[PDB]
Write a protein that binds this ligand. Sequence first.
Ligand code: ACP
Ligand code: MG
Ligand code: MG
Length: 349
Amino acid sequence: GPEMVRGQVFDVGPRYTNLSYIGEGAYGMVCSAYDNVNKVRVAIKKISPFEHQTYCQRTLREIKILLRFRHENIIGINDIIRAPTIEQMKDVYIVQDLMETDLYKLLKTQHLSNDHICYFLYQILRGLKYIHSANVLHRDLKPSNLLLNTTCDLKICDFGLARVADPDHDHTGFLTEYVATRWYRAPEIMLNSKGYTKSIDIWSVGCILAEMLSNRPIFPGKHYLDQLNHILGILGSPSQEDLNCIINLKARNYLLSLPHKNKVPWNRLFPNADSKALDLLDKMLTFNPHKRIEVEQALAHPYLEQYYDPSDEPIAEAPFKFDMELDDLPKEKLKELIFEETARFQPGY
Ligand SMILES: Nc1ncnc2c1ncn2[C@@H]1O[C@H](COP(=O)(O)OP(=O)(O)CP(=O)(O)O)[C@@H](O)[C@H]1O
Ligand SMILES: [Mg+2]
Ligand SMILES: [Mg+2]
């Protein structure tokens, strides 16, 4: 029968063989495999979303976005395997280039030189420039979603929480709550849970930069509200100006009830870090999202001056627009759209 990895069927043969476990998640599993047609090794992400509406919604977004993107610092889709009929489609298999490791794993076994930190950060922001220019928010940037090779090429993966937010329309009040992984969650995800912006991805990049400098997460909260206390424990209490910018009255009143905390200087937390890196970290980990540095300005910061070149940093040819955001649909309909969207890889097409 078809190959198995840790009790999970991977119905991908005969093209793809020699399956080995790489990782997993809430409704999927990732393996390495050998592509017998192209004579290369690939990654295969099995995704099983069809029992739940939210999983279907996210799977359609991930597939649509990754198929349209083409960029050196974003993982591509090479192939998609699924059953020839919608009644038989229980799973979707996304075939991608195999990368050697991710940044989470690298940081467990290795302290990184400034040279490497600098190069990785450049690549994260070059990809994010492309993602933001497409009017996409990633919303789950963290070390385990950054893939790395031995040549230090970096690719952003895991667009499972990603979405489109067309800036022609005010999205305040319509965005999903509780996005990102806790430690990489900007303050406004807690204080403005339905009206945050792409600025949340810059915060996550800041957290990643911090983690590359010390090999430990900067804001390791244990639960929703504790995360915010960890943030304020380093940044200090927000100024009155930054409080006045918080539109939600009960979030602003909640902050006004908290005890005063002083700013911990960056050089005290990272005494051996390059000074330009800390200046950039500061601007990324700025409490007020309106004052927080944007991706293009971050690329032009002096820390990345040896790599910055806007003639070699593509933006999206065709940005996503509002029409394709209308995906709050029953799971049966989402399955049909996923079936349609993956048809370009079927023999019959
Ligand atoms: N193309 C690839 N090459 C090598 N490793 C990969 C890969 N794609 C994913 N991985 C590895 O598998 C892990 C899980 O992949 P991914 O994050 O896409 O799955 P997932 O979305 O189900 C987990 P979650 O939903 O919690 O983010 C990654 O952290 C990474 O280590
Ligand atoms: Mg992930
Ligand atoms: Mg994911």
